[PDB]
Amino acid sequence: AAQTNAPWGLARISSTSPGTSTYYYDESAGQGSCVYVIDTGIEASHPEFEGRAQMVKTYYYSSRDGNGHGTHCAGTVGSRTYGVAKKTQLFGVKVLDDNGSGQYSTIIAGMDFVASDKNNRNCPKGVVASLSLGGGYSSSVNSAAARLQSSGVMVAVAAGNNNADARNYSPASEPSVCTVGASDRYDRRSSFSNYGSVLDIFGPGTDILSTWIGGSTRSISGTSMATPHVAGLAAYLMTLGKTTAASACRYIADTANKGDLSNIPFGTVNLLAYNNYQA
């Protein structure tokens, strides 16, 4: 399949070169997989989700996304126009309030929720969790993310936006999950992206167009935007049978575009997510 005039980030992950504008992907498009978006929620009624999104859990008086961040991330995973995996099922878990904040204990609970809740859902091709959040280092947050991974969910987490070594942030610093940095349309490391030995992969993160609340769209930047590209890619590759939840992060790194990014500090991987689709 070919989607013309796609957002640059979709075109980048199906290309060996920057500067193209068509997203190429296998038509299966993540059908039969599931992605949990653990965030401010998702505006499930947005036309771009086509009935494939639903809220399954909140820790606040409402399950609505009053912020937009969760809706944007979900759009990059799985919306019809802006999404990597256009036929995946999206499940929203609201661990962040409408200001974008949440306590670590609520975030841990939402991760354990997902590890259990997947046994209530039909996801024969596999289960992914996208975590576009983080804070200072916490062993208990890392352990929660390692549990979710070990339960059979591919966990993708944002590296952080501090232009610093991600070893001091959680859950970015957990070795067993997939930690995603951000790049821009010229194949430079995004100026804000964390780096370090704990990063596994880079994805498009600057000026990322996706869904927003009120049935709208908008372009924002952050490693929070790179992470759902990789989460959606994992779901896409698992539907194709190419990899499993346990090995998807390693598979994505092995099949990535290598050496293409600039402004990568010494000791950080120079790997850009790539779907290796050959029409």
Pattern 209-238, Na ion, x by CB under 5 A: -------------xxx--------------
Query: What residue 57 binds from Na ion, Ca ion, Cl ion, none (CB within 5 to 8 A, per partner kind)?
Result: Cl ion
Dihedral sign computed on CA atoms, order 107, 76, 232, 30: positive
Tell me whether residue 137 or residue 277 sits nearer to Na ion (CB atom): 137
Q: What angle do CA 197, 201, 204 make, to 5 degrees?
A: 130
Is 165 designated active site?
A: no
Phi/psi region, residue 236 (left: phi>0; alpha: psi -120 to 50; beta: rest), is alpha
With CB under 5 A as the contact rule, the residue among 15, 58, 81, 217 that binds Cl ion is 58
Which of 14, 190, 224, 229 is the catalytic position?
224
CB of 89 to Cl ion, least distance (A): 18
The Cα 229–Cα 255 span in angstroms is 15
> By rule CB under 5 A, what count of residues binds Na ion?
4
Q: Which of 69, 151, 165, 183 is catalytic?
A: 69
> Which CB atom, from 34 or from 208, has the smaller least distance to Na ion?
208
Catalytic residue check, 72: no
User: What token pair was written down for 148?
Assistant: 């979710």
Q: Is residue 57 a contact point for Cl ion (CB under 5 A)?
A: yes
Counting contacts by CB under 5 A, is residue 130 touching Na ion? no
Q: Does 12 bind Cl ion (CB under 5 A)?
A: no
- Contact status: 67 vs Na ion (CB under 5 A): no
Feature table: binding site for Ca(2+): 16, 175, 177, 200, 260
Any catalytic annotation for residue 151? no
Could you say which of Cl ion, Na ion, Ca ion, none residue 58 binds, taking C-beta under 5 to 8 angstroms by partner kind? Cl ion
Q: Is residue 92 involved in binding Na ion (CB under 5 A)? A: no
Extract the annotated binding site.
16, 175, 177, 200, 260
- Between 150 and 169, how does the x/- string for binding to Na ion read (CB under 5 A)? -----------x--------
- Between CA 125 and CA 239 the distance in angstroms is 5
**Binding-site partner at residue 179 among Cl ion, Ca ion, Na ion, none, CB < 5 to 8 Å by type:** Ca ion
Q: Which residues bind Na ion (CB under 5 A)?
A: 161, 222-224
The residues annotated as belonging to the active site are 39, 69, 224
